[PDB]
mmCIF file of C-alpha atoms and ligand atoms in Angstrom:
data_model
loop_
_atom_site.group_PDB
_atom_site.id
_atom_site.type_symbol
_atom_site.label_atom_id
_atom_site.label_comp_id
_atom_site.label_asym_id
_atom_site.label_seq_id
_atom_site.Cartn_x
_atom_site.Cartn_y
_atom_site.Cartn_z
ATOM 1 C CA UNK A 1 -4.254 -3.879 162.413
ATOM 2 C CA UNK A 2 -2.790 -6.720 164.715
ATOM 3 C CA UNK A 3 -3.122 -6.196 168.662
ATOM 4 C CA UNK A 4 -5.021 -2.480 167.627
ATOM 5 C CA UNK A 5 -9.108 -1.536 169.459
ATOM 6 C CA UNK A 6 -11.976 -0.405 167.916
ATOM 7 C CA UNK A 7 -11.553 3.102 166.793
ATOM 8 C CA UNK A 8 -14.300 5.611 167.745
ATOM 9 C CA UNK A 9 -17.048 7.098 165.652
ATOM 10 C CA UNK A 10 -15.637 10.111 163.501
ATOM 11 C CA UNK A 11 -11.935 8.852 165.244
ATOM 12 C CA UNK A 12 -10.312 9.383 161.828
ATOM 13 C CA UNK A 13 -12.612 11.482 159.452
ATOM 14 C CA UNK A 14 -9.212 11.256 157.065
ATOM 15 C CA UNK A 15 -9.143 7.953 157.018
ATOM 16 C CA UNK A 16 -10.002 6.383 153.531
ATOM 17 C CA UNK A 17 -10.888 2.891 151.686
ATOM 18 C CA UNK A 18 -9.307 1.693 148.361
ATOM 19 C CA UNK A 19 -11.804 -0.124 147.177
ATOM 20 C CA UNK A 20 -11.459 -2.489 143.843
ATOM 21 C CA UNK A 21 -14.721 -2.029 141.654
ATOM 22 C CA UNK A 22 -14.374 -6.050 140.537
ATOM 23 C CA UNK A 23 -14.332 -8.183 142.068
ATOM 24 C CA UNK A 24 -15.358 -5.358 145.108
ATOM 25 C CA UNK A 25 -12.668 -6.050 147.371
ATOM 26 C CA UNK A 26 -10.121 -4.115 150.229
ATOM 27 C CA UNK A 27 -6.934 -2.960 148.186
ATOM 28 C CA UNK A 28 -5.169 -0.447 150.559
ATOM 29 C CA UNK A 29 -6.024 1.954 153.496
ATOM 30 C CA UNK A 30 -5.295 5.980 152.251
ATOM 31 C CA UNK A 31 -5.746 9.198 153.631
ATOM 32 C CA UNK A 32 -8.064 12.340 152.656
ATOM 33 C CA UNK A 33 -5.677 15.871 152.249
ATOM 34 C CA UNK A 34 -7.852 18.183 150.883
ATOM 35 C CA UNK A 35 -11.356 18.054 149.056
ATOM 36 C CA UNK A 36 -10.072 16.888 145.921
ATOM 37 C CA UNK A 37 -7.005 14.629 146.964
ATOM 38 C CA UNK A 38 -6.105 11.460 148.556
ATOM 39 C CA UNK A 39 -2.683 10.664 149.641
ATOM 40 C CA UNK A 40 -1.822 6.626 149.590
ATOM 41 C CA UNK A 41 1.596 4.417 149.154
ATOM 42 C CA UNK A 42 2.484 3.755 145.800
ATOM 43 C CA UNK A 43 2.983 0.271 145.824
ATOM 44 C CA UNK A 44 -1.029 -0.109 146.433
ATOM 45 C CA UNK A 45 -1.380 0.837 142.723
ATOM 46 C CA UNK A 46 1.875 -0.106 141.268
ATOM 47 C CA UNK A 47 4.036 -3.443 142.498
ATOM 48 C CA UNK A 48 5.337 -5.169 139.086
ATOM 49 C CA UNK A 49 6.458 -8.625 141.399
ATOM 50 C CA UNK A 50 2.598 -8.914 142.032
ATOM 51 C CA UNK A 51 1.242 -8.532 139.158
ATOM 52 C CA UNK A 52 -0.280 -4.981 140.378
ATOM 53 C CA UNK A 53 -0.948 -1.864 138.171
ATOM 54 C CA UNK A 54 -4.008 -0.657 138.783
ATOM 55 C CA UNK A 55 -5.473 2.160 136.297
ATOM 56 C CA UNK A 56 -7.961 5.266 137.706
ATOM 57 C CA UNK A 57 -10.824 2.692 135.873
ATOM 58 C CA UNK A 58 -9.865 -0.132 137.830
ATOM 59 C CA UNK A 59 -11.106 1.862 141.619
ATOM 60 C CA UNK A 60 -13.259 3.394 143.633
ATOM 61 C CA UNK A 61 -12.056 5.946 146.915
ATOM 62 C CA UNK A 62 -14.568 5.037 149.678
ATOM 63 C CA UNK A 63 -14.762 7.712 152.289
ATOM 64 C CA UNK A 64 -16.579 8.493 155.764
ATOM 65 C CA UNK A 65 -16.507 4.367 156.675
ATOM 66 C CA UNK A 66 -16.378 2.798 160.172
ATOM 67 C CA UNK A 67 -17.617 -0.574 159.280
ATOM 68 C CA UNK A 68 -15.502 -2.366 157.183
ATOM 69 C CA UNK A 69 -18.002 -4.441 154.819
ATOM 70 C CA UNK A 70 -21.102 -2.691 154.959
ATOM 71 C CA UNK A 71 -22.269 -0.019 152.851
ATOM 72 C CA UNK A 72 -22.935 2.476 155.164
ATOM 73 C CA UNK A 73 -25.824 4.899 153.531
ATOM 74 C CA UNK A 74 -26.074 8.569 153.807
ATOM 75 C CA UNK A 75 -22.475 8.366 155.762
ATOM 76 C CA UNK A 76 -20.068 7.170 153.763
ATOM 77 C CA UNK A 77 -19.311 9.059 150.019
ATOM 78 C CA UNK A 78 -17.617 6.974 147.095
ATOM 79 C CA UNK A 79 -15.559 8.560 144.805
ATOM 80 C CA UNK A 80 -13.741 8.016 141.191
ATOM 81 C CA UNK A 81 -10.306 8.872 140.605
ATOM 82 C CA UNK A 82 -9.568 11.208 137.647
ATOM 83 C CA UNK A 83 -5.559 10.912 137.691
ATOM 84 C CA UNK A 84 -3.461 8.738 139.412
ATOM 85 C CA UNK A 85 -0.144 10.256 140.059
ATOM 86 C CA UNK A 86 3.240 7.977 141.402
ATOM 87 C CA UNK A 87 5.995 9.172 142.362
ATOM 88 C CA UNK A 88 8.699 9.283 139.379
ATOM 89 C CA UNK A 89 10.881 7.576 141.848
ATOM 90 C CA UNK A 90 9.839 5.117 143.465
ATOM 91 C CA UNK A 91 12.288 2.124 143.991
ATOM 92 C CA UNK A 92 10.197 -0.898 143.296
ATOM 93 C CA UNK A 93 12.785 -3.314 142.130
ATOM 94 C CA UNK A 94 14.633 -2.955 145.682
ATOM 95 C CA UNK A 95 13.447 -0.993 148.842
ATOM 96 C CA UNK A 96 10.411 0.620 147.745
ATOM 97 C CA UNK A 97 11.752 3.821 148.760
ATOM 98 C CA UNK A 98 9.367 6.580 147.985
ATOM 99 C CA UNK A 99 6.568 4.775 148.271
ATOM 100 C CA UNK A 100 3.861 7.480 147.698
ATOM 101 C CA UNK A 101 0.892 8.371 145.555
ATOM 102 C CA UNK A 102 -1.741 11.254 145.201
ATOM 103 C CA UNK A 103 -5.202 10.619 143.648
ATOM 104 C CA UNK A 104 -7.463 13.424 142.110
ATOM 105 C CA UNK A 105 -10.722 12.730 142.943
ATOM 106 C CA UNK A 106 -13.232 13.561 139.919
ATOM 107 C CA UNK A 107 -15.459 15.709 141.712
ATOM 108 C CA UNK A 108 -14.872 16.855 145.494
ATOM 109 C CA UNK A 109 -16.402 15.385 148.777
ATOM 110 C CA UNK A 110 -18.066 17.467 151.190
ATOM 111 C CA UNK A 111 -16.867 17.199 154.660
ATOM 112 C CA UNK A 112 -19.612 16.291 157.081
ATOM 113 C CA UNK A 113 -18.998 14.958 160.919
ATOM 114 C CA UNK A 114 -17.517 11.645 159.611
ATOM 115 C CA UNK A 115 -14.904 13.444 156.603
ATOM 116 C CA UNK A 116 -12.364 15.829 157.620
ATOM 117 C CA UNK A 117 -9.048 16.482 155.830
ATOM 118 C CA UNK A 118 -5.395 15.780 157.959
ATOM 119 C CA UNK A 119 -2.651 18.678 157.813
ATOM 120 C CA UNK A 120 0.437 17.870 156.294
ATOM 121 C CA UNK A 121 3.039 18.990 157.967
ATOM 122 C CA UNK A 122 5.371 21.492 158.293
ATOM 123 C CA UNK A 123 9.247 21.543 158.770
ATOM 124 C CA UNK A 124 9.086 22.431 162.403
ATOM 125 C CA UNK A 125 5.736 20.420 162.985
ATOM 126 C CA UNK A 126 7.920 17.262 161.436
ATOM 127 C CA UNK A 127 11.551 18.573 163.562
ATOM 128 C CA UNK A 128 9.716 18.673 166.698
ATOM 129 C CA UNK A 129 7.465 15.412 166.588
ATOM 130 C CA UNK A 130 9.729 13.216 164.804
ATOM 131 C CA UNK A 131 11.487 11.633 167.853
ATOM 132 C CA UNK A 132 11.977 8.324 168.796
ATOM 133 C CA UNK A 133 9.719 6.903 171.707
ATOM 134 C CA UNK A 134 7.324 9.662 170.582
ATOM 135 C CA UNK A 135 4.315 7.731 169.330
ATOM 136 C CA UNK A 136 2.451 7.682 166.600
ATOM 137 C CA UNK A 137 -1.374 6.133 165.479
ATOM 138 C CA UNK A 138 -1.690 3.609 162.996
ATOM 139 C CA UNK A 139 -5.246 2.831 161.437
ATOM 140 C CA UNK A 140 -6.973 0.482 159.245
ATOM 141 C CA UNK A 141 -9.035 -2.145 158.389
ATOM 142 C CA UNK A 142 -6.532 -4.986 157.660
ATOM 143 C CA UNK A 143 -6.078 -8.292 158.963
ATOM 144 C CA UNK A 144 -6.021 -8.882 162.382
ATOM 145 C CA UNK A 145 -3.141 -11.147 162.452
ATOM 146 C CA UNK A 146 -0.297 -12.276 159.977
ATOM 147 C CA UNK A 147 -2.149 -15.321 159.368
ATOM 148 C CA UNK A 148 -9.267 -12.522 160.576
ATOM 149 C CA UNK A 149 -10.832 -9.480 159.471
ATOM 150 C CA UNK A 150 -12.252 -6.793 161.885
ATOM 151 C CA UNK A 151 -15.736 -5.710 161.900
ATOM 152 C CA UNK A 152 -14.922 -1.954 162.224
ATOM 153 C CA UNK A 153 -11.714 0.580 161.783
ATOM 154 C CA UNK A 154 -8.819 -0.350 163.882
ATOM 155 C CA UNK A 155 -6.394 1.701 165.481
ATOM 156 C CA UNK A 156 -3.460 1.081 167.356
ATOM 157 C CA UNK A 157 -0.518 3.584 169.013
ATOM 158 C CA UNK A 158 3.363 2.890 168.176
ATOM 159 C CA UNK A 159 6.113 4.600 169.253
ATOM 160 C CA UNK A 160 8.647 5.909 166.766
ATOM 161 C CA UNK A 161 11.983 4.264 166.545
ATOM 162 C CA UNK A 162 15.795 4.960 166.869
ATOM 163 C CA UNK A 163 17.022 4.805 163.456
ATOM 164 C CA UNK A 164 19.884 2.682 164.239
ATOM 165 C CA UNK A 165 17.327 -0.195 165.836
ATOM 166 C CA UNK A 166 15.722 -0.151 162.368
ATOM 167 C CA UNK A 167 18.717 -0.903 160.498
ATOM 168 C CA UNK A 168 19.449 -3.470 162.340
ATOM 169 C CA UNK A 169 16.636 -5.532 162.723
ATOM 170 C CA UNK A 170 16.040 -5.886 158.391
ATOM 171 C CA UNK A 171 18.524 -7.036 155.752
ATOM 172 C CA UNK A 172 17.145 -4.440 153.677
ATOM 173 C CA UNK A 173 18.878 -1.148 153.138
ATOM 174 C CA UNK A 174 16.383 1.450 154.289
ATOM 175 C CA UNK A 175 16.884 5.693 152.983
ATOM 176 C CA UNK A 176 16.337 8.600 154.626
ATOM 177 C CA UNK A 177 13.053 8.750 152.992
ATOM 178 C CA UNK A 178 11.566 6.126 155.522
ATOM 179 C CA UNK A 179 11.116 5.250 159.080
ATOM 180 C CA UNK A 180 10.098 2.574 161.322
ATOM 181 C CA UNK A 181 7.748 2.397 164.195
ATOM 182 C CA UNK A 182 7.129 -0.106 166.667
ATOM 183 C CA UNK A 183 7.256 -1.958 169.986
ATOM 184 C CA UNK A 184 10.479 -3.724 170.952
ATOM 185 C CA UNK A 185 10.655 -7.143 172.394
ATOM 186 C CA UNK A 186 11.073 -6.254 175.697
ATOM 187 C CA UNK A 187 8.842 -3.328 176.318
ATOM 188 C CA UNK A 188 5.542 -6.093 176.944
ATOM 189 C CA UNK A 189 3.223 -4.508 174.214
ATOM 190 C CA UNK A 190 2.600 -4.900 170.701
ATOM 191 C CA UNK A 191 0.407 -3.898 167.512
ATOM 192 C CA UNK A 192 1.362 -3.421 164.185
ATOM 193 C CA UNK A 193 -0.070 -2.738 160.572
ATOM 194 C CA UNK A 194 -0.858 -5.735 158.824
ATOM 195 C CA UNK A 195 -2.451 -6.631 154.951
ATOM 196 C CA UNK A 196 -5.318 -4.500 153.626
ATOM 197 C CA UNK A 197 -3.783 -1.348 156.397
ATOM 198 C CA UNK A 198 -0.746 -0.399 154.032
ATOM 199 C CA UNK A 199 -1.295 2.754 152.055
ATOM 200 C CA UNK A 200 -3.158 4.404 155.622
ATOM 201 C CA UNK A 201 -1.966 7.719 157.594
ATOM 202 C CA UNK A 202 0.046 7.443 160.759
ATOM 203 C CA UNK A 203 -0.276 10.258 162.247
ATOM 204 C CA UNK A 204 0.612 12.559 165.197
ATOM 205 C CA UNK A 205 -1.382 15.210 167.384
ATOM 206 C CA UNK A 206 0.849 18.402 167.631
ATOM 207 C CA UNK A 207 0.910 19.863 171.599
ATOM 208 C CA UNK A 208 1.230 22.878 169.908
ATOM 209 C CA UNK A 209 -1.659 23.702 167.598
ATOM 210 C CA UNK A 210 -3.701 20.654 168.734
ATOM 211 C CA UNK A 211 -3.821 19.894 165.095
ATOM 212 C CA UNK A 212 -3.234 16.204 163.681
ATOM 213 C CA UNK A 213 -0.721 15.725 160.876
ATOM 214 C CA UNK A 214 0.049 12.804 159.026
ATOM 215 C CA UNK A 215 3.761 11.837 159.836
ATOM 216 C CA UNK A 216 3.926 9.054 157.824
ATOM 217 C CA UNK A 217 2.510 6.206 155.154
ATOM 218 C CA UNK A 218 2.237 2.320 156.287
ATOM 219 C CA UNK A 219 4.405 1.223 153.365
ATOM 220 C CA UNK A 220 6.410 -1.928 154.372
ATOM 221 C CA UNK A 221 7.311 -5.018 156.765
ATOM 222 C CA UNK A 222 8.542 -8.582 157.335
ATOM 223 C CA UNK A 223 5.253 -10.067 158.243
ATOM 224 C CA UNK A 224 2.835 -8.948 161.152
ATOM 225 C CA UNK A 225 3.840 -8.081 164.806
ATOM 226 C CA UNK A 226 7.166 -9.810 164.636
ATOM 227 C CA UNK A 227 9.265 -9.198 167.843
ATOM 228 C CA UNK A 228 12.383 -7.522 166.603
ATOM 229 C CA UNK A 229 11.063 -6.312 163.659
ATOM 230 C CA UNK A 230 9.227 -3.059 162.673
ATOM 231 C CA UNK A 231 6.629 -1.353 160.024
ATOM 232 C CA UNK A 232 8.097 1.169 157.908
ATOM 233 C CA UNK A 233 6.611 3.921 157.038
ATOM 234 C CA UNK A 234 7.421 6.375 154.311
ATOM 235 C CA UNK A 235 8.310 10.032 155.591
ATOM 236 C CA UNK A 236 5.814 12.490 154.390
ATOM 237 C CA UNK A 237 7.495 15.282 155.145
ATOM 238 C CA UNK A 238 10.576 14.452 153.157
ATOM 239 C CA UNK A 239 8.933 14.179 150.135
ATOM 240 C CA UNK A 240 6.292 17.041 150.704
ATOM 241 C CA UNK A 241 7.961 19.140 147.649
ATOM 242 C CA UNK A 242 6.674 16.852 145.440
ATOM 243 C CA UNK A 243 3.412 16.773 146.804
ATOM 244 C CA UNK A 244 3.146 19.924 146.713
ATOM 245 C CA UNK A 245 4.590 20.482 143.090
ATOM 246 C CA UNK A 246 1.789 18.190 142.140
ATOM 247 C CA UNK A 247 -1.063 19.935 143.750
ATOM 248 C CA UNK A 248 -0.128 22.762 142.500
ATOM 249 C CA UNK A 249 0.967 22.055 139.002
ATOM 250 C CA UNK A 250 -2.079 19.878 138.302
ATOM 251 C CA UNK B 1 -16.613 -11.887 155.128
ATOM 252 C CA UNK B 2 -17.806 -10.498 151.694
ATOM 253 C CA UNK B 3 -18.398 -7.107 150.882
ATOM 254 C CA UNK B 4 -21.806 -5.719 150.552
ATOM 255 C CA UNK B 5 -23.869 -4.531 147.195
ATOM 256 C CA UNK B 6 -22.772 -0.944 146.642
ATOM 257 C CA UNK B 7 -25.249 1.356 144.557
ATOM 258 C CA UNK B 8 -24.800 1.035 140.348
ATOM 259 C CA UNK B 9 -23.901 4.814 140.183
ATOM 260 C CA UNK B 10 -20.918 4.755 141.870
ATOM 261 C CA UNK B 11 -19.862 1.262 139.428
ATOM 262 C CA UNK B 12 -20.327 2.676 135.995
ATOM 263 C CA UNK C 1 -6.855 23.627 154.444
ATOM 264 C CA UNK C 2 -8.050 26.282 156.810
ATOM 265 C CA UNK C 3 -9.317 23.049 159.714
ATOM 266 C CA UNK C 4 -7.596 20.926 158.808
ATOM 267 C CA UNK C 5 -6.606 17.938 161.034
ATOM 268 C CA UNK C 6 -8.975 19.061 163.458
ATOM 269 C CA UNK C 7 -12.316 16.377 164.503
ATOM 270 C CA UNK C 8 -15.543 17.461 163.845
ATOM 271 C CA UNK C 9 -16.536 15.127 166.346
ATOM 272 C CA UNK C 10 -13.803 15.788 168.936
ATOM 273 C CA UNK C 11 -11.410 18.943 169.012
ATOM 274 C CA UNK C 12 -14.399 20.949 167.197
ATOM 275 C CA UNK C 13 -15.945 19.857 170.602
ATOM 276 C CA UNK C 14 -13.063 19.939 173.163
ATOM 277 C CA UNK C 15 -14.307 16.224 173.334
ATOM 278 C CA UNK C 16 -10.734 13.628 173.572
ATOM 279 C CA UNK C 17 -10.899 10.286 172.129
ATOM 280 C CA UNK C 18 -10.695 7.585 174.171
ATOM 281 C CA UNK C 19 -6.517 6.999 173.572
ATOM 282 C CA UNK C 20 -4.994 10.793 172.423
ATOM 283 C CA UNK C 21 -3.589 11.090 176.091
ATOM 284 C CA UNK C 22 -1.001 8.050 175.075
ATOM 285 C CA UNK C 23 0.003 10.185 171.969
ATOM 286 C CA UNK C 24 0.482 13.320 174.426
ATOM 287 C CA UNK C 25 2.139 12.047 177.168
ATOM 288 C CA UNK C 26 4.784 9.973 174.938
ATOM 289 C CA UNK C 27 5.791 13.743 174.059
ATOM 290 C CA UNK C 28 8.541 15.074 176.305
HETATM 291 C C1 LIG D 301 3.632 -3.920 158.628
HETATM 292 C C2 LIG D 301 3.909 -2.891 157.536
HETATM 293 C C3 LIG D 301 3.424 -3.203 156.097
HETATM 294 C C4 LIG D 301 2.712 -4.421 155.743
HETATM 295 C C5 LIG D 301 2.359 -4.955 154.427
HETATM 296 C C6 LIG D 301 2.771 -4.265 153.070
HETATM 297 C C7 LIG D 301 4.050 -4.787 152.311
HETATM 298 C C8 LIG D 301 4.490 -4.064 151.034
HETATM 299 C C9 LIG D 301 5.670 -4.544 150.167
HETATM 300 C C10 LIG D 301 6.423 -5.823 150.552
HETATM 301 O O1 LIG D 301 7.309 -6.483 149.693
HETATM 302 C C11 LIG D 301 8.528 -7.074 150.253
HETATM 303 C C12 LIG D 301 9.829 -6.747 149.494
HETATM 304 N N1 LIG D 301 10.434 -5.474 149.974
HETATM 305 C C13 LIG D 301 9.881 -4.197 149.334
HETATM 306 C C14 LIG D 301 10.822 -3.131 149.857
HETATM 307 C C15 LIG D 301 11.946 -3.790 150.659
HETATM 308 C C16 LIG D 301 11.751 -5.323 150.683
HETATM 309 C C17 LIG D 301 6.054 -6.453 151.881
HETATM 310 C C18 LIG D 301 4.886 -5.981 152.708
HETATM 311 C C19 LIG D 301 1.774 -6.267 154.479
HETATM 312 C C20 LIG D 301 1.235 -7.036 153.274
HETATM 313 C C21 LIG D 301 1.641 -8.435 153.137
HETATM 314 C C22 LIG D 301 1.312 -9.240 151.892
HETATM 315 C C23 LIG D 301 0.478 -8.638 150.742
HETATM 316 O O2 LIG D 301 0.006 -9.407 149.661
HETATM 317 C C24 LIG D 301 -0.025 -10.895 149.855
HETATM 318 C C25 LIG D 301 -0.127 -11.749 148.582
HETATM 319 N N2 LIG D 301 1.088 -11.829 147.684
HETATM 320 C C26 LIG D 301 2.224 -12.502 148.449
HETATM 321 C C27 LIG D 301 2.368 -13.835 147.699
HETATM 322 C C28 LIG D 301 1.393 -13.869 146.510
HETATM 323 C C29 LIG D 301 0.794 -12.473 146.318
HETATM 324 C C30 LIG D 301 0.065 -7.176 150.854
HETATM 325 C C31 LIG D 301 0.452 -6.418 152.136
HETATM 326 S S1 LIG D 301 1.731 -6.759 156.139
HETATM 327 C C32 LIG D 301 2.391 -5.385 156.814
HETATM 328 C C33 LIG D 301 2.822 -5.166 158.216
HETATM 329 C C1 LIG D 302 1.213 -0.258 134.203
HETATM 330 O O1 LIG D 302 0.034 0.285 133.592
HETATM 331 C C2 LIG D 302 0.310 1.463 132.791
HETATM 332 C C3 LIG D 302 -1.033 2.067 132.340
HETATM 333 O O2 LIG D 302 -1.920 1.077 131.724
HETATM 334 C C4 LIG D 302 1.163 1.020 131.575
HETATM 335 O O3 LIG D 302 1.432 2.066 130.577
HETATM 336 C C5 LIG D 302 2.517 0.547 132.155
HETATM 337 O O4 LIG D 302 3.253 0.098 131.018
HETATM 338 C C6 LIG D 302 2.129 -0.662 133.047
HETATM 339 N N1 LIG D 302 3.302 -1.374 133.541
HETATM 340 C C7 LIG D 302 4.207 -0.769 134.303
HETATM 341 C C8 LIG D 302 5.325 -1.685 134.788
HETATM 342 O O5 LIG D 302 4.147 0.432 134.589
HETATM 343 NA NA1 LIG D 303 20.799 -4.424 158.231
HETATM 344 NA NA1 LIG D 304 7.180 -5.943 165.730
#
């Protein structure tokens, strides 16, 4: 997280670690749905130009951190991964659109006062919220700067962003299926995911329920806290069918 | 920096 | 899940974090 704060203790009991077994290392940021799934981007475990395509062997799930490097006893709970599951369509090759993935964890994770599941949310929850200016929160233990690591979780609040702005500012073709957030140039703040944060929740408090959903998935950008350029996120919501479908199937 | 030694149970 | 999305720590409390205000105020 670039230009982001400390977060608080138990800030984001959702929040989540990929974690590679060797060499132990930061892979991607993910988010805790239930007792028995984690919800992360897909290009974390699956990106052909990198050379990525990691197998349910290949990590661990790390939940219930603040501190980034330090294994932090009787808090924290690590967990294997029995099935990895991508989404059938995610577009790799060009915009990574649908850039989502759901891990089964082998055995469960009790909650405590550090792990708490985030709501997924609901048509209305996602009409009403989804607005541009309304802002979002971004967090994550990834660089602190394009080009250096934090000592604890970061977090950071964006605004959401008019769709048009979006298109504009990349030479990619973005789908329905994401959205950007961001500060513009002009409005004299910044922040933005960076490395090692992709794969994390943004998420949104609802002034209704006083619940907090996850709105979206850091998924891609142009480098760190560019001016006139934007993170994109991948739009839970929209593709909360096959979540569910998944869930429930398996 | 580096990460820290994580217990053996979790890495098997 | 029955809780979900709400903080142990915070809502379970009536406790606010140190930055949810932003989040609420940006919604008109
Ligand atoms: C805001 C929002 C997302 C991200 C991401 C994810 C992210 C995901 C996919 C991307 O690919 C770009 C193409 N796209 C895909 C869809 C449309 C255009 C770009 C950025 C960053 C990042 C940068 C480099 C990296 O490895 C370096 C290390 N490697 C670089 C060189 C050698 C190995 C891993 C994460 S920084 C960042 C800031
Ligand atoms: C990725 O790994 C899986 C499982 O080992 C393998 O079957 C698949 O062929 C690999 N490559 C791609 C591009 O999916
Ligand atoms: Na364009
Ligand atoms: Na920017």
């Amino acid at each position: 997280i670039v230009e982001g704060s400390d977060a608080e203790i138990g800030m984001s009991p959702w929040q989540v670690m990929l974690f590679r077994k060797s060499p132990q290392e930061l892979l991607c940021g993910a988010s805790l749905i239930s007792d028995r799934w984690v919800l992360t981007a897909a290009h974390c475990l699956l990106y052909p130009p990198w050379d990525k395509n990691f197998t349910e062997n290949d990590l661990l799930v790390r939940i219930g951190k603040h501190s980034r490097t330090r294994y932090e006893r009787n808090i924290e709970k690590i967990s294997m991964l029995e099935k990895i599951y991508i989404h059938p369509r995610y577009n790799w090759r060009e915009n990574l659109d649908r850039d989502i993935a759901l891990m089964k964890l082998k055995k469960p994770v009790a909650f405590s006062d550090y792990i708490h599941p985030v709501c997924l949310p609901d048509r209305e929850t996602a009409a009403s919220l989804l607005q541009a200016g309304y802002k979002g929160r971004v967090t994550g233990w990834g660089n602190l700067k394009e080009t250096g690591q934090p000592s604890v979780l970061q977090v950071v609040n964006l605004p959401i962003v008019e769709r048009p702005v979006c298109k504009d500012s990349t030479r990619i073709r973005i789908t329905d299926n994401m959205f950007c957030a961001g500060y513009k140039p002009d409005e004299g703040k910044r922040g933005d995911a960076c490395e090692g944060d992709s794969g994390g929740p943004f998420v949104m408090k609802s002034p209704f329920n006083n619940r907090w959903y996850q709105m979206g998935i850091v998924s891609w950008g142009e480098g760190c806290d560019r001016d006139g350029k934007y993170g994109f996120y991948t739009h839970v919501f929209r593709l909360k069918k096959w979540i569910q479908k998944v869930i429930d199937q398996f | 920096g580096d990460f820290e030694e994580i217990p053996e149970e979790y890495l098997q | 899940e029955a809780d979900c999305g709400l903080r142990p720590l915070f809502e379970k409390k009536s406790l606010e974090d140190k930055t949810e205000r932003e989040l609420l105020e940006s919604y008109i």
